[PDB]
Amino acid sequence: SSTHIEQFMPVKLAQALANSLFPELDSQLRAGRHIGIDDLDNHAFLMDFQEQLEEFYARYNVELIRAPEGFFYLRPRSTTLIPRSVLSELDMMVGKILCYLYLSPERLANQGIFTSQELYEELISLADEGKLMKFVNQRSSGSDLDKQKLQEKVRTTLNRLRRLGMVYFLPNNNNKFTITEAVFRFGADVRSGDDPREIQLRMIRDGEAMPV
Amino acid sequence: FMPVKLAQALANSLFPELDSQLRAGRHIGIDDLDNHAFLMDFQEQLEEFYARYNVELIRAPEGFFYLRPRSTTLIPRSVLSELDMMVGKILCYLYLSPERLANQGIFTSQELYEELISLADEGKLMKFVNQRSSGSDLDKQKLQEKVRTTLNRLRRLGMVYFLPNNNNKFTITEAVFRFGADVRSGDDPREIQLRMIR
Amino acid sequence: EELLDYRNYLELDVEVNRGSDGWLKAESGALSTGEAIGTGMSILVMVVQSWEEESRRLRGKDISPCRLLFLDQAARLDAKSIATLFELCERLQMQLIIAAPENISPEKGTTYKLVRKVFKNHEHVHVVGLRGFG
Amino acid sequence: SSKSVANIIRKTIQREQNRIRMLNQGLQAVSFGQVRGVRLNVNVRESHAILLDVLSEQQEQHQDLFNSQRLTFSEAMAKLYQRLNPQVDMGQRLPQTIGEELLDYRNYLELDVEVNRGSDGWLKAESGALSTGEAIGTGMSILVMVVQSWEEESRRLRGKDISPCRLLFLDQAARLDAKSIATLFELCERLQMQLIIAAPENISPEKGTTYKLVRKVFKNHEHVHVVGLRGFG
Amino acid sequence: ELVSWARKNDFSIEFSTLRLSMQLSIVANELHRAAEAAEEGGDEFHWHRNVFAPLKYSVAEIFDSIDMSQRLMDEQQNFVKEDIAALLNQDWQAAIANCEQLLSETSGTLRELQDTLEAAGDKLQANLLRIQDANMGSGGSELVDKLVFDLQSKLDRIISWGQQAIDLWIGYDRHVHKFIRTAIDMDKNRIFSQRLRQSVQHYFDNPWTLTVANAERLLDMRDEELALRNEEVTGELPLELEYEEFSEINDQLAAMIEKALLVYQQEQRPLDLGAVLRDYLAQHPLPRHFDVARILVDQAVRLGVAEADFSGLPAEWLAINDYGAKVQAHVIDTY
Amino acid sequence: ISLPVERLAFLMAIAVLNSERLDGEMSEGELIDAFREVCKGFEQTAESVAVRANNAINDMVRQKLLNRFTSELADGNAIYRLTPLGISISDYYI
Amino acid sequence: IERGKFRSLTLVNWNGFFARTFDLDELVTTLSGGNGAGKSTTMAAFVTALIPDLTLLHFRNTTEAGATSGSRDKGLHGKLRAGVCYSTLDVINSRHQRVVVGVRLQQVAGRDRKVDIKPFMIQGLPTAIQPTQLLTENVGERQARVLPLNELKDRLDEMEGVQFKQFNSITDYHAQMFDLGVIPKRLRSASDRSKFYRLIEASLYGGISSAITRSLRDYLLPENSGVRKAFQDMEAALRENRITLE
Amino acid sequence: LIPDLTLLHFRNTTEAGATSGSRDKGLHGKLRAGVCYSTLDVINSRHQRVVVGVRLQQVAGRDRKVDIKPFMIQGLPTAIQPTQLLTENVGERQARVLP
DNA sequence: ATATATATATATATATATATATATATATAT
DNA sequence: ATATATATATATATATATATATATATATAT
Numbered sequence A: 001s002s003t004h005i006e007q008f009m010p011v012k013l014a015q016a017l018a019n020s021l022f023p024e025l026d027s028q029l030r031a032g033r034h035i036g037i038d039d040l041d042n043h044a045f046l047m048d049f050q051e052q053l054e055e056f057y058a059r060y061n062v063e064l065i066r067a068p069e070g071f072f073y074l075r076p077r078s079t080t081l082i083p084r085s086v087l088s089e090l091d092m093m094v095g096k097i098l099c100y101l102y103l104s105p106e107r108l109a110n111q112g113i114f115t116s117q118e119l120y121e122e123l124i125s126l127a128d129e130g131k132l133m134k135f136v137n138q139r140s141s142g143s144d145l146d147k148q149k150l151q152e153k154v155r156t157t158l159n160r161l162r163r164l165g166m167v168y169f170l171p172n173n174n175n176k177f178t179i180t181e182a183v184f185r186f187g188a189d190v191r192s193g194d195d196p197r198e199i200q201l202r203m204i205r206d207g208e209a210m211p212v
Numbered sequence B: 001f002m003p004v005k006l007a008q009a010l011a012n013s014l015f016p017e018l019d020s021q022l023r024a025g026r027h028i029g030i031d032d033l034d035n036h037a038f039l040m041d042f043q044e045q046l047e048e049f050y051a052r053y054n055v056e057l058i059r060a061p062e063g064f065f066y067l068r069p070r071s072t073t074l075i076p077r078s079v080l081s082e083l084d085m086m087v088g089k090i091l092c093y094l095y096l097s098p099e100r101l102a103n104q105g106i107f108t109s110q111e112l113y114e115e116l117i118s119l120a121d122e123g124k125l126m127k128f129v130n131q132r133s134s135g136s137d138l139d140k141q142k143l144q145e146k147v148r149t150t151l152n153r154l155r156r157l158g159m160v161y162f163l164p165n166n167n168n169k170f171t172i173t174e175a176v177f178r179f180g181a182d183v184r185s186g187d188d189p190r191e192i193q194l195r196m197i198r
Numbered sequence C: 001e002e003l004l005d006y007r008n009y010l011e012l013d014v015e016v017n018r019g020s021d022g023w024l025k026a027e028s029g030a031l032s033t034g035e036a037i038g039t040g041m042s043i044l045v046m047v048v049q050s051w052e053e054e055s056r057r058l059r060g061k062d063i064s065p066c067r068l069l070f071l072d073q074a075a076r077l078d079a080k081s082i083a084t085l086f087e088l089c090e091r092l093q094m095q096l097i098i099a100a101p102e103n104i105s106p107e108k109g110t111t112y113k114l115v116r117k118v119f120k121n122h123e124h125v126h127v128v129g130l131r132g133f134g
Numbered sequence D: 001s002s003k004s005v006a007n008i009i010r011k012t013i014q015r016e017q018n019r020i021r022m023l024n025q026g027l028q029a030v031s032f033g034q035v036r037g038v039r040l041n042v043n044v045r046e047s048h049a050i051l052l053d054v055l056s057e058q059q060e061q062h063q064d065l066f067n068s069q070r071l072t073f074s075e076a077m078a079k080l081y082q083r084l085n086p087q088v089d090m091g092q093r094l095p096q097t098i099g100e101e102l103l104d105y106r107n108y109l110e111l112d113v114e115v116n117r118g119s120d121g122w123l124k125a126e127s128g129a130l131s132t133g134e135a136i137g138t139g140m141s142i143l144v145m146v147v148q149s150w151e152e153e154s155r156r157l158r159g160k161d162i163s164p165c166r167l168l169f170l171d172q173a174a175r176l177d178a179k180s181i182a183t184l185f186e187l188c189e190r191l192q193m194q195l196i197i198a199a200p201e202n203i204s205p206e207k208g209t210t211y212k213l214v215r216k217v218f219k220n221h222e223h224v225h226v227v228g229l230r231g232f233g
Numbered sequence E: 001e002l003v004s005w006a007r008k009n010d011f012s013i014e015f016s017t018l019r020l021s022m023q024l025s026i027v028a029n030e031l032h033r034a035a036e037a038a039e040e041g042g043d044e045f046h047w048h049r050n051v052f053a054p055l056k057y058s059v060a061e062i063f064d065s066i067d068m069s070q071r072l073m074d075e076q077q078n079f080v081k082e083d084i085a086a087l088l089n090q091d092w093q094a095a096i097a098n099c100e101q102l103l104s105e106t107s108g109t110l111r112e113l114q115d116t117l118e119a120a121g122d123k124l125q126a127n128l129l130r131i132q133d134a135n136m137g138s139g140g141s142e143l144v145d146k147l148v149f150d151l152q153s154k155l156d157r158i159i160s161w162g163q164q165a166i167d168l169w170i171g172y173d174r175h176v177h178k179f180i181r182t183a184i185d186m187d188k189n190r191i192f193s194q195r196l197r198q199s200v201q202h203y204f205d206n207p208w209t210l211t212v213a214n215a216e217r218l219l220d221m222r223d224e225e226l227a228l229r230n231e232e233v234t235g236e237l238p239l240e241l242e243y244e245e246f247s248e249i250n251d252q253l254a255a256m257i258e259k260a261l262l263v264y265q266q267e268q269r270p271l272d273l274g275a276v277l278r279d280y281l282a283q284h285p286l287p288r289h290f291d292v293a294r295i296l297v298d299q300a301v302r303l304g305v306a307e308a309d310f311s312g313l314p315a316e317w318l319a320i321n322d323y324g325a326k327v328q329a330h331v332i333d334t335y
Numbered sequence F: 001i002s003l004p005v006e007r008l009a010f011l012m013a014i015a016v017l018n019s020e021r022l023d024g025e026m027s028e029g030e031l032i033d034a035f036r037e038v039c040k041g042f043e044q045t046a047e048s049v050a051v052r053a054n055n056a057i058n059d060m061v062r063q064k065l066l067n068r069f070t071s072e073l074a075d076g077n078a079i080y081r082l083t084p085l086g087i088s089i090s091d092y093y094i
Numbered sequence G: 001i002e003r004g005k006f007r008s009l010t011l012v013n014w015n016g017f018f019a020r021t022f023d024l025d026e027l028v029t030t031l032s033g034g035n036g037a038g039k040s041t042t043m044a045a046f047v048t049a050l051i052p053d054l055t056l057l058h059f060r061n062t063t064e065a066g067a068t069s070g071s072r073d074k075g076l077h078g079k080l081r082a083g084v085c086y087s088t089l090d091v092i093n094s095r096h097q098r099v100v101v102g103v104r105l106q107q108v109a110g111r112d113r114k115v116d117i118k119p120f121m122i123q124g125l126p127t128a129i130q131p132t133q134l135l136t137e138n139v140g141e142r143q144a145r146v147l148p149l150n151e152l153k154d155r156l157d158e159m160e161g162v163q164f165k166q167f168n169s170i171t172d173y174h175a176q177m178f179d180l181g182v183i184p185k186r187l188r189s190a191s192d193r194s195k196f197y198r199l200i201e202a203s204l205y206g207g208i209s210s211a212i213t214r215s216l217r218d219y220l221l222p223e224n225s226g227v228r229k230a231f232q233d234m235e236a237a238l239r240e241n242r243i244t245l246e
Numbered sequence H: 001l002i003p004d005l006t007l008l009h010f011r012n013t014t015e016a017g018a019t020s021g022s023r024d025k026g027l028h029g030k031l032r033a034g035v036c037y038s039t040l041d042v043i044n045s046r047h048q049r050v051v052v053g054v055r056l057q058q059v060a061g062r063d064r065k066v067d068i069k070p071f072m073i074q075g076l077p078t079a080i081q082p083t084q085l086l087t088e089n090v091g092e093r094q095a096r097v098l099p
Numbered sequence I, J: 001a002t003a004t005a006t007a008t009a010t011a012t013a014t015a016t017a018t019a020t021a022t023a024t025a026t027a028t029a030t
């Protein structure tokens, strides 16, 4: 009959869109924020109406995607109605390092609470110090001023990732943080035991990762 | 549950694009016939829908629609630069009556650039580009580039419609009236706009 | 229903000629204690007059209702203001009861001195009266 | 966990009760109108002692309430407080907020102001049952105790060689009589407390410094003239 | 303040529970002995040799020993965490059982230590309160009170830690399981970890970047710029403060009236305000009369009450001078 | 084992605060405050207060002077305790 | 020990006052004068100097003390003259150190009766320098002029041994005052500042402030974190138990 | 003048407009046990001497409640005072209030 | 090194819903 | 013929939720 919700929309999609949690979740998602198991309310909301939201966002030419780890996010298409952007190479270095810390048992004593200094130490341990510094400044040669600049850049990138939900600052401390399962996306190029150059082509084809 | 007509409005195929452009801050005037008519029809509910976001859906007296974020806005807010409002007020002034005989609704970046240079004070120009600057070529080039950037930003907002080509020549929409000052009985629009600019 | 009332069509304000400046809206935050108190008294007497004027046409022409007001802790006022108040109340045929802990000594009118004591295991207020001075 | 909680609250309450009771003797029978002395009464609330008891020993008995998916922890606590001790008759405040209020130990103490009005003994101080001067003096007493408490708490942080300044105010002092003002002066001086008081007339001619202000219209604006005053001449 | 002391100094450069039990027994015996000695009483020298030399030194030393034992357990806690962390590096999927055992034993050790601590904390506290009660047996026992005030916290503090440490471990334990349930479940062979490490090392040989939604921010109108008021105010600077002196004429008048009136109290003579005021006002000119009347009344009403005021019979307004001054007061009888 | 004057003074202040601490627990939020005060008394600013404090705390932890425990609820999300060697060094003078 | 004291209060370009300094008393300082003389203005200027928090500052009449008047205006703006104004306090520390704290006030041009406040501090000022003069420049015949913050900074910097500082947050300003034994409590948090202003405001109007009596628990008794921790511990335990039950 | 319990609330001078805080209105404590009276005498423009008044009684109970009864009197002699009407001049030192 | 934009938290005032206590008119027992 | 109990209406004031404004930290950019 007329004046009937089913005329236009499925009942569950309308209920989800009228839920109090919908607006904050939508704003965060459109901003690019990833959703992990920690946000129990938002995560559960996504689980309940996962299909309604994927079909809704399909209207924007963007895929609501749930990685096998269980964290949802958005991947815009080339015809996205919502703009799209790509992380910096330094962002990739730090994201891979965070995935390592999530999986690293050596730091288990930290119990998940990490400081930017430790992150920087691990990063420099595994990466190439000066050749990585080259990107921070083209005229770097190990100068401690440029060293501080790299530390500051790492801090800025860490803040940005926090904005993306990959990391949470502690309720009172912005100098300490806790990692989230979303970081697993930084390993999507190695989660499959195949040739790296084919996984890279597959990913770029899927829109998962552009080159530089 | 949900209001039925609100549900109807959201389902409309125009809703995704219009929602994206609103959340981007764009102003929907009378030129966008479909969007303007849709907003006219479904305002009573889109106002509520965007109030759920702590934002206000405002229909200006000129008629164009827009979104005003509250302090508790759920949509990441941002603030226009000083040069942005200055350029906006320049266009609002240029939405003039002699304008019809001057440019017939089509201006060029040079008109705006010259008007801004002649009209604005030097201190604010330096504040725009940089304080330590003093009447230099590089500073003026950066100022022109920033003018171009803010013009693009206004285009993003729907204030200015570029004439389709790489060249910078455009037209001014009625929504620019947002930059204008209030009009009283007998006040000269030119005088109030210039007093604001001064 | 708000529109149904003529009074709502009217905007009412209280204005004061403060010092060298002209008439300004009386804002409680923009005045000193005594000024506010005096303005309140003025408005009160205005209300009383308006109410009597309203009620007269439903009352015998030879009936003038009693008019009487209060002011506690009057010590907040200076002598000049107090005298102005006395003149005003007199000019309006309005009786006043003002309380002051001995600080001020208004010569005119009746005065009542009070003192509390204990007598027969009970609180008592010794009272004395003076009048006619001036 | 519940038992430990109850225990720590009990200890904190006892410590604070003792500290306040010791502080009470910092007062010396102030004279304000019929008020002859001011005091602070601190007492654990039996309505809350029962709650503590249940929490410490009979937590399990009401697990039903705790393990209800409808109730949050604060709401669970509020509902429990309701279940037992229902004669208190709390108002229309939401269970949520009352629960959080319960999450503060200080709430569990009745903290009241007693006054030795006349010969009626110590009575709860209610503004509705006190003369203006009496109320003013009672307040000033309260504020002085509060500042003393604040100073004492900061004793640890502050250096051993610095004693913070002390200064309070009283506008429209004309509301107070001579006896009350003298009482106030003796109290403030005993407490090394500086005071700034205002009154249209010079109510304190024989103590401290005094100044007299006059406002004059002057070239279409205003100027205030200040003149010093002296007790004797 | 200790900073200057350090600066001028210029200096620079056993987990067994049977132990804890035996120290606890020793402490109980010594504390009971000291409490009984204090309760018995004695002279200042006896009070000293029974409550300050034996108690002070012994209790301080053995509480310090118990605290050191707790610190050694804390060290062991740290070491076992480190051992687990190293083990998971060497066995990965095969150390799960080993780590679970180690967690179990550590938790059990913590339970036994807490149990032993609480086995005597209450009674030791009771003995300390007993010593507090017996402390007041002399006026020179102030120092004892300090210990009876200090040795409290340590004990309680110790017990607090015995749980707090546990509060920490039961937390850490959980985390470890989560790791095993999360880190190694999806990396059973750990290959993903090595592959990630090599990818990090050789990332820039194939630099790739992810895509994320980057919706635009809602540009807003900047509020009008705020301009203060500048006027370069100038004006005459105030001169030196003048001065004025208060007239004590009313004080003299009050002294005169009080002296003239004290006789009524002295003789307990019934005072009639009418006649007294009428008589006394004759001594002053009319303009001052009011300022006199008031003062006199202020002096008179402090002297007894008027008994007629309880009769329910209002008093009259007696004239007290010419020009029309009146007074209403009953006779003051009851002094 | 290497304790400059500032590190040694920080250790002594920490010990004093622990002695005056109610329940014998020290969150890093107070350790940073103690380090700020000691460095202020010693009048030296090589770097920011926070970086120096963090470096010193880590140095003593690795030098077997302090034990750190991760507790999110704690102020600073960590709890520090003197190690037996640290206790010995502090009480050697005290 | 010798407690610090408030020596004097200086008012610049205030409503009615051009440059006036009242020397405080060790125990009691009294002000008299007819209604509207400006005594209330003086207390307002003081407290502003003490707590420049614009949010807390609200000058209700003694009447309607705490009763909402709907004026929308805090009453501070109309108490100032156009241009720059200052309010400063001299304090003698228990260390017998003469420190001059102060604030520059300035009306904001516009229909909104809004004002700007900038706190500042001076240490080591010679005892012979009076604030009235220090803040004013004698220009013309006996016609001293007021000088702005930049001019004041230049003047002070030119003199030796005096330390001038300007604060970007009233928080740091409070921290410094507390450091110099000016404030009993350390106003670390905004709630601290609110409580402080509550205390002083109640004293100003005098008598029993409803807020004070209602929050006597808070104002007297200190906050304890251990209880909070124990409660949180309970909360975690209960949440786990509910998880298991579900 | 206005014998209405709902409106009568003798808040202290301070807090002239602040909330109740407590529950009491402040009237009960101003009375004494027993029967009390409050009366006005008025002379009209018609020069009629009218005595209006109220009887008060502290209602015994857990709470501080008061009972008020209005009344009016006309035709009184100018020579008789209100106190005389309401009090009996019994032989005791102090008079007696009558209901 | 410092101007500027952004996010967060708190106090404050507004507006609305709602329960409480009292006053007034009628009903019904004495 | 009277006095007490009921139902109604009303203002009080209590609490909540909202919206605003200010201060703060602090992360960026020149």
Ligand SMILES: Nc1ncnc2c1ncn2[C@@H]1O[C@H](COP(=O)(O)OP(=O)(O)OP(=O)(O)O)[C@@H](O)[C@H]1O
Binding pocket: C029, C030, C031, C032, C033, C034, C035, D198, D200, G015, G033, G034, G035, G036, G037, G038, G039, G040, G041, G042, G075, G076, G077, G078, G079, G080
């Ligand atoms: N914000 C303001 N705007 C306008 N006039 C003001 C303002 N504040 C104070 N005034 C006026 O300045 C004069 C000083 O008032 P203030 O209350 O300080 O004086 P006072 O001597 O303490 O008076 P009172 O004892 O009556 O309160 C009065 O005329 C007052 O009206």
Ligand SMILES: [Mg+2]
Binding pocket: C032, C033, G035, G036, G037, G038, G039, G040, G041
């Ligand atoms: Mg005033």
